[PDB]
Coordinates of C-alpha atoms and ligand atoms in Angstrom, one line a residue:
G1 CA 0.0 0.0 0.0
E2 CA 2.1 2.9 -1.5
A3 CA 5.8 2.4 -2.3
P4 CA 8.6 3.3 0.1
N5 CA 10.3 6.6 -0.9
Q6 CA 13.9 5.7 -0.9
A7 CA 15.2 9.1 -2.1
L8 CA 18.4 10.3 -0.4
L9 CA 18.5 13.6 1.5
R10 CA 22.0 14.9 1.2
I11 CA 23.2 17.1 4.1
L12 CA 25.8 19.6 2.8
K13 CA 28.4 21.4 4.9
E14 CA 28.2 25.3 4.7
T15 CA 32.0 25.4 4.0
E16 CA 31.5 23.3 0.8
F17 CA 29.6 26.2 -1.0
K18 CA 30.0 29.9 -1.6
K19 CA 27.4 32.7 -2.3
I20 CA 28.2 34.9 -5.3
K21 CA 25.2 37.3 -5.6
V22 CA 21.4 37.6 -5.0
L23 CA 19.2 36.2 -7.8
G24 CA 15.8 36.9 -6.1
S25 CA 14.1 37.9 -2.8
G26 CA 10.7 37.6 -1.3
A27 CA 8.9 37.0 2.0
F28 CA 10.3 33.4 2.1
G29 CA 13.9 34.8 2.1
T30 CA 16.6 35.1 -0.5
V31 CA 17.9 33.0 -3.4
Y32 CA 21.7 33.3 -4.1
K33 CA 23.8 32.3 -7.1
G34 CA 26.6 30.1 -5.8
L35 CA 29.2 27.4 -6.3
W36 CA 29.2 24.0 -4.7
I37 CA 32.7 22.5 -4.3
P38 CA 32.3 19.0 -2.8
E39 CA 34.8 17.1 -0.5
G40 CA 38.1 16.5 -2.5
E41 CA 36.1 15.9 -5.8
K42 CA 37.8 18.5 -8.1
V43 CA 34.4 19.8 -9.3
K44 CA 32.6 23.2 -9.1
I45 CA 28.8 22.9 -9.5
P46 CA 26.8 26.2 -10.2
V47 CA 23.9 26.3 -7.7
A48 CA 20.9 28.4 -6.6
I49 CA 20.8 28.6 -2.7
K50 CA 17.4 29.2 -1.2
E51 CA 18.0 30.7 2.3
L52 CA 15.1 31.0 4.8
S53 CA 9.9 30.8 12.9
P54 CA 8.8 27.1 13.3
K55 CA 6.1 27.1 10.5
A56 CA 8.5 28.5 7.8
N57 CA 11.0 25.8 8.7
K58 CA 8.3 23.1 8.4
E59 CA 7.2 24.5 5.0
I60 CA 10.8 24.6 3.6
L61 CA 11.3 21.0 4.9
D62 CA 8.0 19.9 3.2
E63 CA 9.2 21.4 -0.2
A64 CA 12.7 19.9 0.4
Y65 CA 11.0 16.4 0.9
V66 CA 9.1 16.7 -2.5
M67 CA 12.1 18.3 -4.3
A68 CA 14.5 15.5 -3.1
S69 CA 12.0 12.9 -4.4
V70 CA 12.0 13.8 -8.1
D71 CA 14.4 12.8 -10.8
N72 CA 13.5 13.8 -14.4
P73 CA 15.3 15.9 -17.1
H74 CA 12.3 18.2 -17.1
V75 CA 11.9 18.7 -13.4
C76 CA 14.2 20.5 -10.8
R77 CA 15.6 18.2 -8.1
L78 CA 17.0 19.2 -4.7
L79 CA 20.9 18.7 -4.7
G80 CA 20.9 19.0 -0.8
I81 CA 20.2 21.0 2.3
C82 CA 22.4 22.9 4.7
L83 CA 21.5 22.9 8.4
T84 CA 22.8 26.3 9.6
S85 CA 21.1 28.8 11.9
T86 CA 18.8 29.3 8.8
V87 CA 17.9 26.2 6.7
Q88 CA 19.2 26.4 3.0
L89 CA 18.0 24.5 0.0
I90 CA 20.8 23.7 -2.6
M91 CA 19.3 23.5 -6.1
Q92 CA 20.7 23.6 -9.7
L93 CA 21.5 27.1 -11.1
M94 CA 19.1 27.7 -14.0
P95 CA 21.2 30.5 -15.6
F96 CA 18.5 32.0 -17.9
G97 CA 16.0 32.5 -14.9
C98 CA 12.2 31.8 -15.2
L99 CA 10.5 31.2 -18.5
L100 CA 8.0 34.0 -17.9
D101 CA 10.8 36.7 -17.8
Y102 CA 12.6 35.0 -20.6
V103 CA 9.6 35.2 -23.1
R104 CA 9.1 38.9 -22.1
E105 CA 12.9 39.8 -22.6
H106 CA 13.7 37.7 -25.6
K107 CA 10.3 38.0 -27.5
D108 CA 12.0 39.4 -30.7
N109 CA 14.2 36.2 -31.0
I110 CA 11.7 33.5 -29.9
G111 CA 10.5 31.4 -32.9
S112 CA 7.8 28.8 -33.1
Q113 CA 10.3 25.9 -32.7
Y114 CA 11.3 27.1 -29.2
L115 CA 7.7 27.7 -28.1
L116 CA 6.4 24.3 -29.2
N117 CA 9.5 22.5 -27.8
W118 CA 9.0 24.3 -24.4
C119 CA 5.3 23.0 -24.5
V120 CA 6.6 19.4 -25.1
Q121 CA 9.2 19.7 -22.2
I122 CA 6.6 21.1 -19.7
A123 CA 4.2 18.3 -20.7
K124 CA 7.0 15.7 -20.2
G125 CA 7.9 17.1 -16.8
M126 CA 4.2 17.2 -15.8
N127 CA 3.6 13.6 -17.1
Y128 CA 6.6 12.5 -14.9
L129 CA 5.0 14.2 -11.8
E130 CA 1.8 12.4 -12.6
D131 CA 3.6 9.0 -12.8
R132 CA 5.1 9.9 -9.4
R133 CA 1.4 10.6 -8.1
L134 CA 2.4 14.3 -7.5
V135 CA 0.0 17.1 -8.0
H136 CA 2.0 20.3 -8.5
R137 CA -0.9 22.8 -7.6
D138 CA 1.3 25.8 -8.8
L139 CA 2.2 25.3 -12.4
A140 CA 2.7 28.7 -14.2
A141 CA 5.4 30.2 -16.5
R142 CA 7.1 31.8 -13.4
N143 CA 7.7 28.2 -12.1
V144 CA 9.3 26.9 -15.3
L145 CA 13.1 27.7 -15.2
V146 CA 15.5 28.0 -18.1
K147 CA 18.8 25.8 -17.9
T148 CA 19.5 26.8 -21.6
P149 CA 17.0 28.3 -24.1
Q150 CA 16.5 24.8 -25.5
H151 CA 16.0 23.1 -22.0
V152 CA 13.4 24.0 -19.4
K153 CA 12.3 22.4 -16.1
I154 CA 9.3 22.7 -13.8
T155 CA 10.1 23.7 -10.2
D156 CA 8.6 25.3 -7.0
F157 CA 7.2 22.3 -5.1
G158 CA 6.0 24.6 -2.2
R159 CA 2.3 23.6 -2.9
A160 CA 3.0 20.1 -4.3
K161 CA 1.1 17.2 -2.7
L162 CA 0.6 13.4 -3.2
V163 CA -3.4 30.9 -3.7
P164 CA -2.9 31.3 -7.6
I165 CA -6.5 31.9 -8.7
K166 CA -5.8 32.9 -12.4
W167 CA -4.0 29.5 -13.1
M168 CA -6.5 27.4 -11.2
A169 CA -9.1 24.9 -12.4
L170 CA -12.7 25.9 -11.5
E171 CA -13.1 22.8 -9.1
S172 CA -10.0 24.1 -7.3
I173 CA -11.3 27.7 -6.8
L174 CA -14.8 26.6 -5.8
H175 CA -14.2 23.3 -3.9
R176 CA -10.3 23.0 -3.3
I177 CA -10.3 19.8 -5.5
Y178 CA -6.8 19.2 -6.9
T179 CA -5.9 16.4 -9.4
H180 CA -3.5 15.8 -12.3
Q181 CA -6.4 17.2 -14.4
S182 CA -6.5 20.4 -12.4
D183 CA -2.7 20.7 -13.2
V184 CA -3.7 20.3 -16.9
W185 CA -5.8 23.5 -16.5
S186 CA -2.7 25.3 -15.2
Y187 CA -0.7 23.9 -18.1
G188 CA -3.2 25.5 -20.5
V189 CA -2.7 28.9 -18.7
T190 CA 1.1 28.4 -18.8
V191 CA 0.9 27.7 -22.6
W192 CA -1.2 30.9 -23.0
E193 CA 1.5 32.9 -21.1
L194 CA 4.2 31.5 -23.5
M195 CA 2.2 32.2 -26.6
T196 CA 1.4 35.8 -25.6
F197 CA 5.1 36.3 -24.7
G198 CA 4.4 36.7 -21.0
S199 CA 1.0 38.5 -20.8
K200 CA -0.8 38.6 -17.5
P201 CA -3.9 36.3 -17.6
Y202 CA -7.2 38.2 -17.1
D203 CA -5.2 41.5 -16.6
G204 CA -7.1 44.0 -14.4
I205 CA -9.8 41.5 -13.4
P206 CA -9.6 40.9 -9.6
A207 CA -9.2 37.2 -8.4
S208 CA -12.7 37.3 -6.7
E209 CA -14.3 38.0 -10.2
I210 CA -12.4 35.0 -11.9
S211 CA -14.7 32.1 -10.6
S212 CA -17.9 34.0 -11.8
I213 CA -16.2 34.8 -15.3
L214 CA -15.2 31.1 -15.7
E215 CA -18.8 29.9 -14.7
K216 CA -20.3 32.0 -17.5
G217 CA -17.9 30.3 -19.9
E218 CA -15.3 33.2 -20.5
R219 CA -11.8 31.9 -21.3
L220 CA -8.4 33.5 -22.0
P221 CA -8.4 34.9 -25.6
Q222 CA -6.7 33.4 -28.7
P223 CA -3.1 34.7 -28.8
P224 CA -2.4 36.4 -32.2
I225 CA 0.4 33.8 -33.1
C226 CA -1.8 30.8 -32.4
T227 CA -3.5 28.8 -35.1
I228 CA -6.9 27.3 -34.1
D229 CA -4.9 24.0 -33.8
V230 CA -2.9 25.4 -30.8
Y231 CA -5.8 27.4 -29.2
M232 CA -8.2 24.3 -29.4
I233 CA -5.6 22.5 -27.3
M234 CA -5.5 25.4 -24.6
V235 CA -9.4 25.4 -24.7
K236 CA -9.6 21.6 -24.1
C237 CA -7.3 22.2 -20.9
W238 CA -10.1 24.6 -19.7
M239 CA -13.2 22.3 -20.0
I240 CA -15.5 22.1 -16.9
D241 CA -15.3 18.2 -16.9
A242 CA -11.8 17.5 -15.6
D243 CA -11.8 14.0 -17.3
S244 CA -12.7 15.8 -20.7
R245 CA -9.4 17.7 -20.5
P246 CA -6.4 16.2 -22.3
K247 CA -3.9 14.0 -20.4
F248 CA -0.2 15.2 -20.1
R249 CA 0.8 12.1 -22.2
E250 CA -1.5 13.3 -25.1
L251 CA -0.2 16.9 -24.7
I252 CA 3.3 15.5 -25.3
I253 CA 2.1 13.8 -28.5
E254 CA 0.1 16.7 -29.8
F255 CA 2.8 19.4 -29.2
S256 CA 5.5 16.9 -30.6
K257 CA 3.6 16.5 -33.9
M258 CA 3.4 20.4 -34.1
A259 CA 7.1 20.8 -33.2
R260 CA 7.9 18.8 -36.4
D261 CA 6.4 21.5 -38.6
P262 CA 6.3 24.6 -36.3
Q263 CA 5.4 27.3 -38.8
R264 CA 2.2 25.5 -39.7
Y265 CA 1.0 25.9 -36.0
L266 CA 2.4 29.3 -34.8
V267 CA 2.6 32.4 -37.0
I268 CA 5.5 34.6 -36.1
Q269 CA 7.1 37.5 -38.2
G270 CA 10.7 36.7 -39.0
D271 CA 10.5 33.2 -37.6
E272 CA 13.6 30.8 -38.5
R273 CA 15.8 34.0 -38.9
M274 CA 15.8 34.3 -35.0
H275 CA 18.9 33.4 -32.9
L276 CA 19.0 32.3 -29.2
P277 CA 22.2 31.4 -27.2
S278 CA 23.3 27.7 -27.4
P279 CA 26.2 25.6 -25.9
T280 CA 27.8 25.8 -29.4
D281 CA 28.4 29.6 -29.1
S282 CA 31.6 31.6 -28.0
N283 CA 31.5 32.6 -24.3
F284 CA 28.2 30.7 -23.7
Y285 CA 29.5 29.2 -20.4
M286 CA 35.9 28.6 -14.8
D287 CA 38.1 25.5 -14.4
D288 CA 36.5 22.1 -13.2
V289 CA 32.9 23.5 -13.6
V290 CA 30.4 20.7 -14.0
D291 CA 26.6 21.1 -14.4
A292 CA 24.5 19.4 -11.6
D293 CA 22.9 17.2 -14.3
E294 CA 26.4 15.5 -14.9
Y295 CA 27.4 15.4 -11.2
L296 CA 26.0 12.0 -10.2
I297 CA 27.2 10.5 -6.8
Ligands
4ZR1 C1 10.4 30.5 -4.1 O1 11.4 29.4 -4.1 C2 11.6 28.9 -5.4 C3 11.9 27.4 -5.2 C4 12.2 26.8 -6.6 N1 13.3 27.5 -7.2 C5 14.3 26.9 -8.0 N2 14.3 25.6 -8.2 C6 15.3 25.0 -8.9 C7 16.4 25.7 -9.4 C8 16.4 27.1 -9.1 N3 17.4 27.8 -9.6 C9 17.4 29.1 -10.0 C10 16.4 30.1 -9.7 C11 16.6 31.4 -10.3 C12 17.7 31.7 -11.1 C13 18.7 30.7 -11.3 N4 18.5 29.5 -10.8 N5 17.6 33.0 -11.4 C14 16.5 33.5 -10.9 C15 16.1 34.9 -11.1 C16 17.2 35.7 -11.9 O2 15.0 34.9 -11.9 N6 15.8 32.5 -10.2 C17 14.6 32.8 -9.5 C18 13.4 31.9 -9.9 C19 14.8 32.9 -8.0 F1 15.2 31.7 -7.4 F2 15.8 33.9 -7.8 F3 13.6 33.3 -7.4 N7 15.4 27.6 -8.4 C20 13.1 29.0 -7.4 C21 12.8 29.6 -6.0 F4 13.9 29.4 -5.2

């Protein structure tokens, strides 16, 4: 009756890592860019260090539990924790930040190939979470991070289980019902954010008016770049009947077929003549630096 979770929680010494600069800050605490230099290993791993009252410590340890329990190319895993006066989460540095800020800042160089591929990768990551019986409950473009422009990962397990109104399924707003199918709704909203190059969903409408608006049948509008093929997918993610919504495995298939002929599915001016940084560029990436994805003890 439910499988033992044999994930390893790695406790890291404070002396093993250094903080370089602040990446972000909120009520939770601060996230630092850093380097992890294990034992006598001759490796430097670029890391994001989340630094943090008894309840805040329980919530960070709950997120640490979930984050240490995942292992997929399209999901962010916990590298370890540091037990100092303040508890720190050691995660992989995602050097291009969140996908939301990336689509806003690089809009003039984002072609249909990148957009459709990001959709496939998010669906792959989400399908993995589903296989793991994990309901994210906070999927949004802000919680998809960019390792490279061609590789994105889902993160922020602070709400994950075995309030973001504008990304939530109607059952979730009204009854607090969360399933893999309620994550599919959030997936649809995330796709809309990517296709509109980071527009705010239902901008100006207060969160208390969203449930009423959804009940009448109003949905997010068709982004200008989206063909009816792409929009019809987003719309199916926003059906009232949760079981009528597509499954993540089907979203992988649908977006993959589209990623094979991207210009037939997304209409972007100057598409294919657009350039984004890749690991085959000068000064893209300093001795003994190894990405967390290749550091496997
Ligand atoms: C609220 O806590 C969440 C927990 C999940 N998290 C996360 N998960 C895995 C890897 C990772 N690394 C990570 C996060 C980064 C980053 C580089 N790497 N650059 C930024 C800024 C410039 O945009 N961020 C954001 C999201 C920040 F963390 F500052 F808020 N960050 C991001 C954040 F710490």
